[PDB]
Design a protein around this ligand. Structure first.
Ligand SMILES: O=c1nc[nH]c2c1ncn2[C@H]1C[C@H](O)[C@@H](COP(=O)(O)OP(=O)(O)OP(=O)(O)O)O1
Ligand SMILES: O=c1nc[nH]c2c1ncn2[C@H]1C[C@H](O)[C@@H](COP(=O)(O)OP(=O)(O)OP(=O)(O)O)O1
Ligand SMILES: [Zn+2]
Ligand SMILES: [Zn+2]
Lengths: 277, 180, 180, 277, 277, 277
């Protein structure tokens, strides 16, 4: 009911040599850089507001606690972006990034499009470390700006720290992305029409990501394809610790789960990215 | 073409209802014979007569049944008036004691459209005559004298009988509720 | 298991027919309620009562209906005796003139096996009492005095009543024709 | 909710001048010839079996009481056909048939196909009275037999008295026609694909007639026509005394009810057949 | 001409100890649970439509009055299933079901297949009351679903209230079952090839049940068995009040009538089911 | 920062006598009827699937655990609706509903529109208990169906048990309502343009309810009203146990919190509904 690493490796080679495999990188991909995930941010927002971090967690979800933070005082969200810039893109996080085996194995492949939902320059920065060049696309001005001819386009799906208007963190910013009208939303839905995705270090907790894969099946089911042909183009979900409910929800959306070895999280991902080559 | 049909086998009831509701082009006439149930209550018999006449003719039907409740007979015949006038013709004036001759002439229409049965009941106080007098009309009209009047239904003409009889108040109620 | 079923809702008729035909193991008992048609003729009502009770219970059924034809009322009630004793309880002794009190107590069984209806009729001459007397029995037994006897059906016991009543001759005719 | 005679008259002229109107005649069409309907047969079967006619009626339906009659004794069904032949096609029923206004008005029109469900020669006999010639088709040998070129084909749908094997009266003969494999069944289902029918003197009590109009809608609904185009080809049901339930059941099957005047049944039908001309 | 209880008891023991006796339970089997039969449903449908219950009954048969109900308004049939579910399977009908002597005597025997035509969980619920376990089979997904090894399969022949698409109540749903293509139809016709049936509380009023026993004789008569061997495998029809016509119709179809005592309907059935043990 | 009962009572009288107050009733309004809330359903779904109820809760949210239930087997959601209808609309829940002080105080007021998100007939059933008449509107056929002239319209916002296609319980049904295209969605957004709402027994956990109040502020902020006039039309949120984060999120959306006494939940609500009169 779940692919292993050796089973999923010839399936990922076929989609990569055809140029139809696109990585989707989450907050767990920057975990070996000693960065906060979605839980250590809330522990830092609770310290500023005067909450204990265990009491602040039980008043709402991740989107709702950041919405409460941003309206506590004026200019409270601007300060957070400044603080995150200092801690996510610091020089000691740069130094952990050249010697990271996941970021080396990611940049060794010749991708054309990479999607990320984290606010750090460590996915395009991994491509600059390997001598390659990348193109960060986050806002409308980036898509219409000049690029080079054949350069890997890194789509910052949730925003970048050097453009603080593009960061979606609060609940009102997730509701603004439910219209699927932002330039990262329109680019994602067109790439999903034709490409397989590889989710690495990401857990489907964002209700706007799950809503995009929902509405691709409304195109898939209305097109009245067979049992054989509607199940042909799959997406892949590499996860150490998926539960018992979530892999069966995603089978509806043509998403297969690749079970990685949970003893060493960083080496299991790196062996997956080296098996694509 | 008519939309309502008045069912009777009694040709004397037919010329009464055609005297007032005759010019209505929405009313037809049928002659199917039905069998009444055994009960003295007028409401029970006329309601079971419409379900038995709709089953015969299968169109929206209007049936009619009467009663001649008498105080001296504790309400008898009631809706059993059809076999009394067959058995006791003018001896019915003699079986009732002189001095307590009061009676009620009741009459009921029930129209059934196939889904609902609606009963219209009118009623005339009166008293049984000491002897049968009068030639006009039909069954038990020579024996019934309405209250206030001295004459019978048989002694009065058809315009004058319907100004006292229960049918003269049931024309207007049937015309209004059916739009005839 | 029984093969014939005597249908009545009257629990006083039930203990009479179980007094004589009770030991017959081929006779069962049912209590379905039927509705009689409006006619004074006993033969017509009992024949339409068996077709209406076979439709209810769907087994070979035996029904019973009576008559109390009176000379002073020209045969009334006849088979209309059920709503008279409801209306006129002991005033029925008073509405009939003294001197012509003669009447007939008729009674009829009709058994229907699902294909044929056979009617057995017995009959007892008598006369209506000047006033109701006696405690035993049930409906109209305090008012009927058989011919030759001075007492009523109410004054006599159940063995003595069935030596005069129509049911005492209808036991033997029902037992012989059905093999009970 | 129900057509009158003057409303349905231009609708029947249009289908008749295109040659796409076919009469369907029932047992009520032979009622002015003083013939039994489906209730006076059962009163005659009960007299032979020793039943009272009101007690025999409450033991089953019309199909089931005739099934009980036919198995009461050997050769009991053959005798019924012989008796019906002497009573239905007698010389005094012939003499009532020339002076009948319905049979004159039926034969005045130039039909091409007439369906009947009654066992009498009074529908093709009405055509012989008007100088026209008819062709009775009841069995397989009649369909493959020789006819003339342009002659009205009278389809005896339930059989004819001169071919006693074709008569469907008992319950086992109605169940044998549920396969829709008999030659009158196959001819009816192909004429129903292309023609409007006019039901005169017939009440839908046969569960094999109702099953044919059921399965024409299974072709109509599976063909996924619009609301406008699936309701275009109607059938017509002339009846003096249709109830409150049956006209709404037949609206499903594109059958419209023509309310005739119930005071005179014979003259109301004759004015309908004269309005088609 | 009709078996009694003591005559039919050794005939039912022989077929039961060979494992070739299958009960067929009707609407009269749930009558001691104070549930409506086919007449009190129509009295409840007439109240919703605004009819008097005696006037609504004379416009058509049971199948046709429910067809008129279901097309009176949108979602009118869905409401009926909801109402029936709350009335038929209520908690006070559960409490009458443990102390019912028929349902105790039914579950005391070790059946393998039970067919029912009523929409209530009181036949498989009687098996759960006796500690046994049952398997309800109503739709195509139930037949291909997982069961246990040796468990009594309760075939809901007309549908179940928890699967409202399987309920056949209207006339169009009976005509859809005339093709004998539904999964309860195909399972019934194969069990009828090899097994005796025991009809309890059921009256042959469904024209699709009668059509299945019709077409088993078309296999029986075409196989040209003798007089002795074609009459060997019988079916049994326990009924308090069968008329004069219907027992002779069913003798054609190898169905024998067991006359039960009509004075107490519940105790007569319970003594029949205890005589099989 | 939070209204009390006596402070909010003259604010609710003013909106009610103008006819511009609409109740919005949640799952906590049917809690005195001994019905499951959103947590006891999941405890019942876990028993069917073979989970322990505490282990099943930690694999996803409420929408996602019901999505996992509905795809475990065919016809698994249909059975849930049938079971829910037996337990939510049972006769003992009816008997607790006449003697409930909240349902009496709700029906004593002359409302015109009531919205509910629970699947039970106990809000319109409370209006039938007080002699009033209600009109349940759940699907497209209900909105175009016939009603009476001045009758309180009860809008079943999440569906009704007698129309099982309208029930939104699984995650895919919540995503289908994100388009705001359903007939309860279109009716809610037009009533929110002109009316104050009173949330009783409801906690904002549905991401489609929160998204509707989000997009009403996008109309409110783009209309460029002042500080005084954009804060004039308020909505009211009666809750015993609102936390510390959620009342400040809803101040953005013109939703005021009415703090009720948490010692007796049923009597605190009933005193609020009696203070409106
Ligand atoms: O207003 C009336 N003025 C004078 N006589 C009346 C009247 N109304 C009824 N009668 C007589 C007629 C019949 O002898 C008996 C009613 O019995 P009734 O069943 O209605 O007469 P019926 O069976 O001959 O005709 P129908 O088929 O309309 O019931 O009392
Ligand atoms: O031999 C009798 N000795 C005394 N009284 C009798 C007798 N026979 C009938 N009666 C009374 C009973 C009832 O008051 C009426 C007949 O009406 P009747 O319709 O048969 O009585 P019922 O409807 O209560 O019972 P059942 O269902 O058997 O018809 O006269
Ligand atoms: Zn009459
Ligand atoms: Zn009686």
């Amino acid at each position: 009911t779940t692919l292993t690493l050796s089973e999923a490796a010839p399936l990922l080679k076929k989609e990569f040599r055809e140029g139809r495999l696109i990585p989707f990188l989450g907050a767990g991909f920057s975990k070996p850089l000693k960065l906060p995930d979605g839980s250590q941010l809330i522990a830092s927002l609770a310290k500023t507001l005067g909450f204990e971090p265990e009491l602040f967690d039980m008043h709402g979800r991740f989107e709702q606690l950041a919405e409460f933070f941003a309206i506590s005082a004026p200019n409270r969200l601007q300060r957070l972006v400044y603080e995150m810039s200092l801690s996510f893109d610091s020089a000691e996080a740069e130094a952990l990034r050249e010697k990271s085996p996941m970021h080396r194995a990611l940049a060794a492949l010749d991708w054309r499009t990479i999607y990320t939902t984290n606010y750090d320059k460590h996915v395009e920065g991994a491509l600059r470390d390997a001598g390659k060049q990348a193109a960060v696309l986050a806002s409308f001005a980036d898509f219409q700006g000049p690029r080079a001819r054949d350069v890997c386009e890194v789509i910052k799906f949730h925003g970048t720290l050097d453009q603080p208007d593009t960061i979606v963190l609060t609940e009102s910013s997730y509701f603004q992305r439910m219209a699927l009208d932002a330039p990262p939303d329109q680019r994602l839905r067109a790439d999903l029409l034709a490409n397989s995705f590889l989710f690495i270090g990401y857990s489907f907790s964002d209700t706007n990501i799950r809503y995009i894969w929902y509405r691709m099946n409304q195109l898939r089911e209305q097109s009245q394809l067979g049992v054989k042909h509607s199940q042909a183009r799959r997406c892949f979900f590499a996860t150490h610790g998926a539960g018992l409910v979530q892999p069966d929800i995603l089978q509806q959306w043509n998403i297969d789960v690749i079970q990685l070895d949970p003893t060493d999280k960083s080496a299991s991902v790196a062996r997956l990215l080296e098996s694509i080559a | 073409a008519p939309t309502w049909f008045y069912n009777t086998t009694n040709s004397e009831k037919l010329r009464e209802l055609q005297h007032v509701l005759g010019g209505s082009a929405k009313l037809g006439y049928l002659t199917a014979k039905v069998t009444e149930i055994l009960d003295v209550d007028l409401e029970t018999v006329i309601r079971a007569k419409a379900i038995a006449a709709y089953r015969a003719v299968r169109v929206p039907v209007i049936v009619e049944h009467g009663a001649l409740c008498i105080d001296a007979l504790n309400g008898l015949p009631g809706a059993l008036v059809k076999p009394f006038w067959e058995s006791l013709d003018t001896r019915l004036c003699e079986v009732i004691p002189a001095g307590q001759r009061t009676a009620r002439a009741r009459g009921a229409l029930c129209y059934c459209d196939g889904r609902e049965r609606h009963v219209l009941i009118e009623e005339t106080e009166g008293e049984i005559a000491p002897s049968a007098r009068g030639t006009g009309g039909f069954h038990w009209d020579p024996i019934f004298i309405p209250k206030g009047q001295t004459r019978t239904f048989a002694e009065m003409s058809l315009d004058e009988k319907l100004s006292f009889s229960p049918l003269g108040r049931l024309h207007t109620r049937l015309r209004t509720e059916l739009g005839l």
